Design a protein around this ligand. Sequence first.
Ligand SMILES: CC(=O)N[C@@H]1[C@@H](O[C@@H]2O[C@@H](C)[C@@H](O)[C@@H](O)[C@@H]2O)[C@H](O[C@@H]2O[C@H](CO)[C@H](O)[C@H](O)[C@H]2O[C@@H]2O[C@@H](C)[C@@H](O)[C@@H](O)[C@@H]2O)[C@@H](CO)O[C@@H]1O
Ligand SMILES: CC(=O)N[C@@H]1[C@@H](O[C@@H]2O[C@@H](C)[C@@H](O)[C@@H](O)[C@@H]2O)[C@H](O[C@@H]2O[C@H](CO)[C@H](O)[C@H](O)[C@H]2O[C@@H]2O[C@@H](C)[C@@H](O)[C@@H](O)[C@@H]2O)[C@@H](CO)O[C@@H]1O
Lengths: 308, 308
Amino acid sequence: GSKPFTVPILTVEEMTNSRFPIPLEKLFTGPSGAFVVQPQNGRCTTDGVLLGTTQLSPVNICTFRGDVTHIAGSRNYTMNLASLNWNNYDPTEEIPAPLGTPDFVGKIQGLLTQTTKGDGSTRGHKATVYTGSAPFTPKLGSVQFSTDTENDFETHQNTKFTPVGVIQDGSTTHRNEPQQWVLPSYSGRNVHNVHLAPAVAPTFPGEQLLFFRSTMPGCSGYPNMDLDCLLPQEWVQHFYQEAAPAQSDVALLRFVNPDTGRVLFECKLHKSGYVTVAHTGQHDLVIPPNGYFRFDSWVNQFYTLAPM
Amino acid sequence: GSKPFTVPILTVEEMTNSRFPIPLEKLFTGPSGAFVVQPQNGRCTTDGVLLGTTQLSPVNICTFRGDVTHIAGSRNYTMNLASLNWNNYDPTEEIPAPLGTPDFVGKIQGLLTQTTKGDGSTRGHKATVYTGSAPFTPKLGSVQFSTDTENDFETHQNTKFTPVGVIQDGSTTHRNEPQQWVLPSYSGRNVHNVHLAPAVAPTFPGEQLLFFRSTMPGCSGYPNMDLDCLLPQEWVQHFYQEAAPAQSDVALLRFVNPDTGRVLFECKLHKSGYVTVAHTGQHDLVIPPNGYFRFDSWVNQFYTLAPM
Ligand SMILES: CC(=O)N[C@@H]1[C@@H](O[C@@H]2O[C@@H](C)[C@@H](O)[C@@H](O)[C@@H]2O)[C@H](O[C@@H]2O[C@H](CO)[C@H](O)[C@H](O)[C@H]2O[C@@H]2O[C@@H](C)[C@@H](O)[C@@H](O)[C@@H]2O)[C@@H](CO)O[C@@H]1O
Ligand SMILES: CC(=O)N[C@@H]1[C@@H](O[C@@H]2O[C@@H](C)[C@@H](O)[C@@H](O)[C@@H]2O)[C@H](O[C@@H]2O[C@H](CO)[C@H](O)[C@H](O)[C@H]2O[C@@H]2O[C@@H](C)[C@@H](O)[C@@H](O)[C@@H]2O)[C@@H](CO)O[C@@H]1O
C-alpha cells in the first residue's frame, strides 16, 4: 500500500548541483574513508524530508539576503540576515543555519545588489564572502562581505548576494581552497554546529559514494573548483513532491543507455539520500548523454552490487 | 489511452522563473492587448516540446559561454560563442538563438569568469551585455560584453557569463529599460528573427494572461525589474519528462488553498504553454503560501471561466 517510488528521467547534464547554482557535468566516484562527508545542501530523504540547510530552489543556493552596514576603513560590509522570504531571521529554528547557506569553507565571489525602496534606485558591486572567517556567523544572523566599494551601499535597504564562483587568494597554495568537505562553523569558531544532516559513507566492502559533480567557476587564483553533491537538486524537488515511502533502506537503481538498451551500471540509493556504487578508486564515469537512472526495486544494506 | 496530465504541486514561491535564474515571487495578471507577448525562454508545450530558445536548466538562463577577444581602446570583449556544452556553435540549428539566450532587450550585468586550461589559473570581472546593441548577434555566434578590465582576460580559453541583474544607464529615464516584452534582434538589427515561439494572447472576452512574476536584481540606475514568465521552469522540466498528450486545446486548472480546502480561482493552461484567467485590469494576485495548482479536466478555447 505504498506509493511507488521513482526518480526523475532527466539526464545528468539536464540537472543542477544542489550545493551551488550550476549545472551537473558528470558522475564521479572515489574513496572517502579518510574524511567526513557531511554536506548540508542537497540533503533529502527519498520520502521527501529535507535535511540540513536544504531548500527547494536551485537558485537560492549560496545566496544571502538582508541589510548591510559598512565597516569603517574598509570595503567590508556586515549583512544582518533576513529569511529567504525577507522576513526577520529566527536563530532558534532547528536548522544549522539559514536555508541555502553555503556548506563548505571557501571564498565565494559574486555580486551584492541593492534596491532603495523609495525611489527604485539600485546598485551592485563585486563581493566575496569567506565562509571560514571569524565573522561568518550565519546561524547567529550575520556574515561579512569584502566588496569593491567603500560608500555606495545604503543602510536599511534590502540587499542580496548572488554567488558566481570561488577564489583562491592570500596565503594558500594551488588548489588548496575551497575545501568542499569542510563545514563552516555556522555560529563561529568556538561554537559547535547543530542540527546537521548526518555524515554519509558506504557501509559495504568495495563500495564508494557516487557523486554528482560540477566545476565551479573560478574568479581569481588557483582554486579547487570541484563540487560534489549527493543528490541533484531536481531529485530533491522530486522526492519532496512525490513523498513516496521507503519500503527498505535501499532503492536499487539501474543506469540505462537508450542508444543500446543496455544497463551500464547499478547503484544503491539509500533512503537517507545518497548513492553508492561498487568500485575501488577515483574514477570519472563515462556516460552517454542520454543515459538515465531508473528505479527497479527495493533491497537492503546487505545487497551486493555488480561491480561498476 | 492517453497518459494523464499533471502539473507540479510546488507552490509559486517554491519555483523558478524561466526567463531569468531567480525565484518566483507572485502571480500577476494584466492586459496585454496593446503589445506582443512573445518570450522565447520558458516556452514548452504541455506535452513536453521545448520551444524558442528554451532549455531545461534553471541556471543556464541568460548565460553565455565561449572565448573572448579584447577590443582595443576599451574594456570591451567580443565573445565567440560555444554551445551549452562547450562545443562549437552551430548557427544553422532551427532555433532563434543559442539556447538560454536572453529574450529581452536590456542591460544585463553579471560576472565574466575564465579558467586557463594549462595551469588552472582563474579570473573574474564584472560585465554587462546590452542585448539591444548592434553587436548583439548571438544567432550569428557573437556578442559583446562591457567589463571592468582592459587586460586580464586571455584569448582561447573557456569563458562564462553568469547573469545577476539589470541596469538602467546612459540616456534612458526611470524604469524605461529593460523592456521585457521586446525581443532582441538575434542576428542584428537588419536581419529578422527566426524559429520563434509564437506570440500569445487570450482569445476570450474578459480574459488575461496569467504571469509568473519575479523581480530582477538591479545593479545600477532605475531599472524596471519586473519579469514575467508564462511557465515556471519546473513546469517546463515536468512537461518535458512526463510528455502527457494534450487531449484538448485547454487544460483546466484549479488553484487550491489547503488551509481552507477551497478553490481560490480557476484558470486555463493552453496546450501550447501559457495560462489565462478571467479578469480585467492589472492585479497582483494575493495567494496563500501553500497554495497550489491542480489539473482537473480538459476543456477548450470556448470554456467560460469563473471570474478570478
Ligand atoms: C582578480 C585579481 O586581480 N586577482 C589578482 C591575481 O590575479 C588573478 O589570479 C591570477 C592567478 C591570474 O589568473 C589573473 O589573471 C587573475 O586576475 C594575482 O595573481 C597574480 O597574477 C599574475 C597575473 O596578473 C600571475 O598569474 C601570478 O602568478 C599571480 O600570483 C600568484 O597567485 C595569486 C593568486 C597570489 O596567491 C600570489 O601570492 C601568487 O604569487 C594576485 C597576486 O597579486 O593578486 C590578485 O589576487
Ligand atoms: C554602478 C555605478 O557606479 N553607477 C553609477 C550611478 O550610480 C548607481 O545608480 C544610482 C541611481 C544609485 O543607485 C547609485 O547608488 C548607483 O551606484 C550614477 O547614478 C547617479 O548616482 C548618484 C549617486 O551616486 C545619484 O543617485 C544620481 O541621482 C544618479 O544619477 C542619475 O542616474 C544615473 C543612473 C544616470 O542616468 C544619470 O544620468 C542620472 O542623472 C550614474 C551617474 O553618473 O553613474 C553610474 O551609472
